[PDB]
């Protein structure tokens, strides 16, 4: 069994987006979401009882959730988009499971779909600026990798040669609507000045590949 | 109407130990009540529900108890898979409710962060602005506080951080404050420190720099 979403979205504020659960050999289909760093959140879905559609109080006016028995195909469409709906939005079979003194219960039962990603942004793909985190026993380095959209961004070190001590950062989103990281290494002090540290900045939705070397500033 | 919450919030366990979380719901919900399991960004698996009933391959030291406002989940001897979030859902003919979720993580013994501080490159500065990045390494457990300090001043609303999951060897994180002035403000002050707390150390440990030195 398979449900198979459509693919990551950015989006305009104000906006809206339709995402599409195609189920894999009629089910009712649920939808739910998990915006960076936070819980799981019920949107909505068809009800296996009534076959019509049951939404979450704080959508309702908002979704619409529909179904193309012909396809297989449920869809969840939100409009009105705001920078809190950027998150995944999963789907899952909404199953009849059990019944107890006449009343029947479901459940969102497995496998869910792998989420679509739904970003919402005004920004313009982006790629980063890259500064050094200049190094001052074990010392500490890295580079700053500001200023891009959307995600993600790969860091290496010394083309792959330095992997142990690495730290590479969740991005944080900034107050402009772009991402930034940082990815750190640590290496011995008495290597510095005889070893070169670069670091290798890769961002693929703007093509743009950046090397910069990181050493201790005169 | 209906409100789930769980706790603890975190809960820091050793492989083999007997682990219980709870979900409390504000008003009864009867055994109308699941249990979930959430590996960071992947979709969530089916547990239990109707509060006690194991979902069909699940493995059997998942247990879950309780009725009416107050239910558990119980682990009876927590294996490496089982490092997740786990939520509580109150469901019913018209909607489902997910709690907020408990995190476990692996125990591992107290280790002090190793703390840098890293004044803005001159090259970003000649664009403009001045990001300072203070960057706690290799600590555990995971509550840490980071406080940023301008010629003593205490700053509040001008930082962002970011954590590491915790690592795969030696059962760490690490952390990253990042400061972001205007390069107008950031040539208005000359001490920029970053004062770090955590159990692992009797004192707080500070870093700093004075600008352009």
């Known amino acids: 069994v398979q449900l198979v979403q459509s693919g990551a979205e950015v989006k305009k504020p104000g906006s809206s987006v339709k995402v599409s659960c195609t189920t894999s050999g009629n089910y009712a289909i649920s939808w739910v979401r998990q915006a960076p760093g936070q819980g799981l959140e019920w949107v909505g879905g068809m009800s296996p009882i009534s076959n019509t559609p049951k939404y979450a109080q704080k959508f309702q006016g908002r979704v619409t959730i529909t179904a193309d028995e012909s396809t297989s195909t449920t869809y969840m469409e939100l409009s009105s988009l705001r920078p809190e709906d950027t998150a995944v939005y999963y789907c899952?079979?909404?199953?009849?499971?059990?019944?107890?003194?006449?009343?029947?219960?479901?459940?969102?039962?497995?496998?869910w779909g792998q989420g679509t990603l739904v970003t919402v942004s005004s920004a313009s793909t982006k790629g980063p600026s890259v500064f050094p985190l200049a190094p001052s026993g074990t010392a500490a380095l890295g580079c700053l990798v500001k200023d891009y959209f959307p995600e993600p961004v790969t860091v290496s070190w010394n083309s792959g040669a330095l992997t142990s001590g690495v730290h590479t950062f969740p991005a944080v989103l900034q107050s402009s609507g772009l991402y930034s990281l940082s990815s750190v290494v640590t290496v011995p002090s008495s290597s510095l000045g005889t070893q070169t540290y670069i670091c290798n900045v890769n961002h693929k939705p703007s093509n743009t590949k950046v090397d910069k070397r990181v050493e201790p500033k005169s | 109407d209906i409100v789930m919450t769980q706790s603890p919030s975190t809960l820091s366990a050793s492989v083999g130990d007997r682990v219980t979380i709870s979900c409390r719901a504000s008003?009864?919900?009867?055994?109308?009540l699941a249990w979930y399991q959430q590996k960071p960004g992947r979709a969530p698996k089916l547990l239990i529900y109707?509060?006690?009933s194991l979902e069909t391959g699940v493995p059997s030291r998942f247990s879950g108890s309780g009725s009416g406002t107050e239910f558990t989940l119980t682990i009876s001897s927590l294996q490496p898979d089982d490092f997740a979030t786990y939520y509580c859902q109150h469901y019913n003919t018209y909607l489902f409710t997910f709690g907020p979720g408990t995190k476990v993580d692996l125990k591992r013994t107290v280790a002090a962060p190793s703390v840098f501080i890293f004044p803005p490159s001159d090259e970003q500065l000649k664009s403009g602005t001045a990001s300072v990045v203070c960057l706690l390494n290799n600590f555990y457990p995971r509550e840490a506080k980071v406080q940023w300090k301008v010629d003593n001043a205490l700053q509040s609303g001008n930082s962002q951080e970011s954590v590491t999951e915790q690592d795969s060897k030696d059962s760490t994180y690490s952390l990253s404050s990042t400061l972001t002035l205007s390069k107008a403000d950031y040539e208005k002050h000359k001490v920029y420190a970053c004062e770090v707390t955590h159990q692992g150390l009797s004192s707080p440990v500070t870093k700093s720099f004075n600008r352009g030195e």
């Open positions: 109707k509060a006690s």
């Open positions: 899952a079979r909404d199953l009849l499971k059990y019944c107890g003194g006449g009343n029947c219960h479901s459940l969102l039962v497995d496998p």
């Open positions: 008003q009864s919900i009867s055994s109308w």
